[PDB]
Amino acid sequence: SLPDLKIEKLDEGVYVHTSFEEVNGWGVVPKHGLVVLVNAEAYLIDTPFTAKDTEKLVTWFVERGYKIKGSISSHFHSDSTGGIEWLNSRSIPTYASELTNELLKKDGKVQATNSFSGVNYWLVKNKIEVFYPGPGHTPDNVVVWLPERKILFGGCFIKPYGLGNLGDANIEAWPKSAKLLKSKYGKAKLVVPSHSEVGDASLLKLTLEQAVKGLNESKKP
Ligand SMILES: Cc1oc(C)c(S(N)(=O)=O)c1C(=O)O
Ligand code: NA
Ligand SMILES: [Zn+2]
Ligand SMILES: [Zn+2]
């Protein structure tokens, strides 16, 4: 009864995948991830919520002649990681930061088979970069940068109009983290949030404004 998985071309070699979940209070929430094509290899930037939609996504690309080389999950929540177990079962390399894999284990979830540490990580040299801005939406949240098309996948860190689910947030750190991201990716042409429409570098400033207001709200009784 949920909207079908969507796959829409965003730019040369870049697709947005949109999967849907009902979230109590938030309604029917779209989740955007990317598929990035390097040569004839496909990289999932976040998995759909479900194994079934992860399989539909993979099959769509494989039928068109792309080889699934890996997934990277931007944070531990199921809107980024729901398909890791299914990918693992198909011997598709899954990636997450050491911190994301720690928070997956803490949450009783299947871990990524491959991990990385530190602040900047090249999943694919000169094509797909992982950057940790610091804690915000979650302690582990990372962004994914595509240097060639100047596309930033913000995941659930980019929150231009409201912060959404604060359950795992570090509201004290989020402003400092958003200042760092804003300083690093002003050159972004496209910024792709998890749960709202694609925009431009202005989404980094709007996110900073929301983080500052969230921290203020957290200090009220
Ligand atoms: C709107 C929304 O729905 C869900 C299911 C999430 S998350 N990434 O916290 O699970 C959020 C969010 O704030 O990212
Ligand atoms: Na794997
Ligand atoms: Zn989340
Ligand atoms: Zn989310």
- Gap between the Cα atoms of 207 and 162, Å rounded: 8
Ligand index nearest the alpha carbon of residue 159 = 1
| Ligand 1 shell residues, CB under 6 Å | 21, 23, 26, 29, 77, 79, 137, 156, 164-165, 194-195
Catalytic residue among 32, 127, 159, 182: 159
Residue type, 35: V
Pairing type for strands 14-23 and 27-38 reads antiparallel
Helices 174-184 and 202-218 pack at an angle, to 10 degrees, of 170
Which CATH architecture best describes the domain 1-221? 4-Layer Sandwich (3.60)
SS in 3 state form for the chain?
CCCCCEEEEEECCEEEEEEEEEECCCEEEEEEEEEEEECCEEEEECCCCCHHHHHHHHHHHHHCCCEEEEEECCCCCHHHHCCHHHHHHCCCCEEEEHHHHHHHHHCCCCCCCEEECCCEEEEECCCEEEECCCCCCCCCCCEEEECCCCEEEEECCCCCCCCCCCCCCCCCCHHHHHHHHHHHCCCCCEEEECCCCCECCHHHHHHHHHHHHHHHHHCCC
What does the block give as tokens for 120? 């900047």
- Gap between the Cα atoms of 30 and 49, Å rounded: 10
Report the sign of the C-alpha dihedral through residues 14, 31, 79, 210, in that order.
Answer: positive
The atom number, within ligand 1, closest to the CA of 163 reads 13
142: phi then psi, degrees, rounded to nearest 5: -120, 160
Residue 34 CB partners (closer than 8 Å, separation 6+): 10, 14, 15, 16, 17, 44, 45, 46, 144, 146, 151, 153, 192
- Gap between the Cα atoms of 92 and 60, Å rounded: 15
Site to probe by mutation for ligand 1, drawn from 23, 46, 100 as the one with most ligand atoms within 8 Å of Cβ, is 23
The three-point CA angle 187-191-193 to 5° equals 155
Residue type, 69: K
- Gap between the Cα atoms of 212 and 115, Å rounded: 31
CA distances from 211 to 38, 135, 186 (A): 34, 11, 18
72 near 95, Cβ under 8 Å?
A: yes
β-partners of residue 96 are 115
- Gap between the Cα atoms of 46 and 55, Å rounded: 13
Residue 18 CB partners (closer than 8 Å, separation 6+): 3, 5, 6, 8, 30, 31, 32
109 near 86, Cβ under 8 Å?
A: no
- Gap between the Cα atoms of 72 and 67, Å rounded: 15
Residue with tokens 């720690």: 102
Does residue 17 carry a catalytic annotation?
no
Q: How many CB atoms lie under 10 A from the CB of residue 93?
A: 16
Query: What is the longest distance spanned by two Cα atoms in the chain?
Result: 56
Does residue 170 carry a catalytic annotation?
no
Residue 53 CB partners (closer than 8 Å, separation 6+): 5, 19, 82, 83
